[PDB]
Design a protein around this ligand. Sequence first.
Ligand SMILES: Nc1ncnc2c1ncn2[C@@H]1O[C@H](CO)[C@@H](O)[C@H]1O
Ligand code: MET
Ligand SMILES: O=P([O-])(O)O
Length: 511
Amino acid sequence: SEPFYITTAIAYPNGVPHIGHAYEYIATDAIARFKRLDGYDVRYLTGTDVHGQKMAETAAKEGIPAAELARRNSDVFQRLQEKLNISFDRFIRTSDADHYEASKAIWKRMADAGDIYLDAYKGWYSIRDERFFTENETTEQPDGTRIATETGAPVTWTEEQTYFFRLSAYTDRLLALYEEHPEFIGPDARRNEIVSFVSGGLKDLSISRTTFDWGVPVPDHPDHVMYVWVDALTNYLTGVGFPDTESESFRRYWPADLHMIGKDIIRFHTVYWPAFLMSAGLPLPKRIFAHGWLLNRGEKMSKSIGNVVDPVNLVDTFGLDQVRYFLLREVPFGQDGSYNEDAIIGRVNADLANELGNLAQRSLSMVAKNLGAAVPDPGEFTDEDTALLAAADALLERVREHFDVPAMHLALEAIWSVLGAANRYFSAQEPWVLRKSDAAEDQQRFRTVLYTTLEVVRIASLLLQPVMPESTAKLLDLLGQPTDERDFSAIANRIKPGTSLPAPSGIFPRY
Ligand SMILES: Nc1ncnc2c1ncn2[C@@H]1O[C@H](CO)[C@@H](O)[C@H]1O
Ligand code: MET
Ligand SMILES: O=P([O-])(O)O
């Protein structure tokens, strides 16, 4: 059992969670679930990033303390992930006691390494982005305001005596990392952008603040709070037992195999983060993958369904596994994408209700009515039977490779390509004609076709468990699959003839 440590970015709980958050959580959950079913020892971390000016300002506007806003809104984020059936091992919050100790410890490591110094900082700060910008990185608007050119967010002039991390000292070491380990950043286009950014030279990074107290206090300097990002990035270490490096959780899980993030926070994870760990003397994560941005087309409010960007509303309207499948099928993972109401309906009704649902229902109903509610004993397999089964048998290896990218969309496309072949096979064989035939050869052929169909459905159902946990669980129940035989290793074992099957019913209803 090889360890596999996967994480998501921890969101600022400044407002309600939206479709973008849900997109990242489900995508990561699918990989974490896949690895569990593939025989890995998985730890899966997610949570919230509660400190910073952005959070403090939101709290002040609402008229409640920052700690109150942080706790209340984080509860909403956790409840969403529980509703999305996310199999996280820990929901971390940067307000956690062990995270305070971890943050103080990594700061100490970097200071002891000689990479932290006190100097005067002058520059522009984007509160919305929690990010520093130079004078040349800003644009003086015709109305007199100053914004950050890249993001469009308003910037505030800042003059503070802060602590600095020696990022300028790590430029070439970071460049060597990208060259020697190209897998460190994914997809490829994102790595090229990071290489280009670092090649322009790096300046030292301000890592403390003096003008507010909503954050982790700097050890021995209570007048300073840690830059929200240094604090935030350390959560990946806290979730495995840091600063207890001798603990068994830290020994087996660190370094992380995959950091799942969006492309708006790539530089924090691929430039600052590895530099922090180099300074601290800690091994680096194996891979950072930046997924694309998902956005709603048309109006936010729909006359029929309501809030289209609200993940809770989408789940209640279409069903959890319907939403989970749509997000991972509609957009090529890593790329930017868009969606509307009709795109979801079209995907629910065609792919799930008809392609998978109807194929499973038509086959299982013929078993329960015409074959005594038991898996039929097959006869001799024809060239058409074999060609379909071979295509279904080839999936596990294909899908495994897609999940390692990660590219869940291509894994789903490969499965549905086989499901398409299974539907064409079912239609060409005409089992509804064979069941009524008096001839003995046709009655045996009827048994083989149904066995061949049920085996393909079984393989597909086992493979789709990471994407649609509950719907596949029900579909495997109807196929008479034992509870302990549902890992990917069971795909090699053909469905047993004579196995008793429960009364079948539709699992993927039409919208
Ligand atoms: N609209 C969106 N589409 C895709 N990802 C998003 C969106 N909004 C936030 N995220 C992601 O959620 C994570 C936590 O805020 C970040 O990695 C960020 O990239
Ligand atoms: C350590 S990941 C931090 C992510 C950040 N809080 C965001 O919402 O963009
Ligand atoms: O671009 P990659 O990271 O999917 O190969």
